[PDB]
Amino acid sequence: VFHKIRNEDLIFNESLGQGTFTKIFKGVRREVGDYGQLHETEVLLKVLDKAHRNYSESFFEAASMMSKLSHKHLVLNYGVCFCGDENILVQEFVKFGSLDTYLKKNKNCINILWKLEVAKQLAAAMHFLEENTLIHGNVCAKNILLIREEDRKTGNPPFIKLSDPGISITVLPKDILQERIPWVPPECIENPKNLNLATDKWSFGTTLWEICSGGDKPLSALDSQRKLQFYEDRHQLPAPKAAELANLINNCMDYEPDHRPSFRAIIRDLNSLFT
């Protein structure tokens, strides 16, 4: 059960765009913080129409269950505003935003070791979720949030978090799942009830492809029908431009869900690259 935030303490400043049946804003939350200090905290606001009751309930149940598992690589949600005809998730505002946009804005002038570090951090988050048997179901590079850039002087690496899960693919329209190929795995295209921890291993592979491809979207040239044929003919993605993780990508994007490796195994594989 999330902390309730009053509409009166939320200021909406910028309209940023949309997610899946959500509207996204930058704003400020007025709050009493540590030592009783009054703060105006920057927040990322995700707004759902309460008339889409099934979507809203799925969205907030997913955010709540994940926010019960505090972890350094899982986004902080401050709470929720049951805000009239809308329900609003109040999330921390991450300074550098989504990783796919970041990589594009930096023109993929990012070395493989940076990419490896981000993959290790995501894998650490996913291992924690796996140990907690919590399915995320929407792993993608847009949901990797960059808290801090690398600092070459100190040797500090970039630092990421994984965003909230959003509406479950067990509730979303089939057309949305197909648009989300190749993040949504083939078994969930066949039947969304096949959602399983194995789903996240597949999507982790697709996410690593995105990271290695500078924020390109795999299969962007394919409409939904060509994306179905992609899975029918059992194709794999092409090796990304930075090919060091291509084997891992393909091992995670296994058409047999039960064969996808555990996140402990994935981490050991990541740790073994470059001796």
Binding region for ligand Q9X (CB under 6 A): 16-17, 19, 24, 44, 91-94, 97-98, 142-143, 145, 163
Comparison of 70 and 133: residue with beta carbon closer to ligand Q9X:
70
C-beta closer to ligand Q9X: residue 17 or 155: 17
The nearer residue to ligand Q9X, 169 or 266, going by C-beta atoms, is: 169
* Nearest residue (beta carbon) to ligand Q9X: 97
- Detail the DSSP E strand segments found in 84-133: 86-92
Minimum distance, C-beta of residue 5 to ligand Q9X, in the bound complex (Å): 15
d(CA 190, CA 21): 23
Query: Quick check: bond before 186 cis, omega within 30?
Result: no
- Altogether, the residues listed in the chain come to a count of 275
Alpha helices by DSSP H, 75-232? 99-105, 112-131, 174-179, 186-190, 197-212, 224-232
Minimum distance of ligand Q9X from residue 56's CB (angstroms): 17
Smaller CB distance to ligand Q9X: residue 142 or 260? 142
Q: Which is nearer to ligand Q9X, 56 or 91 (CB)?
A: 91
| Cα separation, 263 vs 129, whole angstroms | 10
Q: For residues 104 and 259, which CB has a smaller minimum distance to ligand Q9X in the complex?
A: 104
DSSP 3-state of 49: strand
Tell me how far, at minimum, the Cβ of 238 lies from ligand Q9X, in Å: 26
Q: Whose CA is closest to 160, among 73, 55, 271, 255? A: 73
Q: How far is the CB of 8 from ligand Q9X (least distance, A)?
A: 22
Alpha-carbon gap, residue 179 to 114, rounded angstroms: 29
| Beta-ladder partners of 15 | 25
Least separation in angstroms between CB 28 and ligand Q9X: 13
- Smallest gap from residue 72 Cβ to ligand Q9X (A): 15
How far apart, in whole angstroms, are the C-alpha atoms of residue 200 and residue 58?
18
Q: Are 257 and 185 in contact (CB under 8 A)?
A: yes
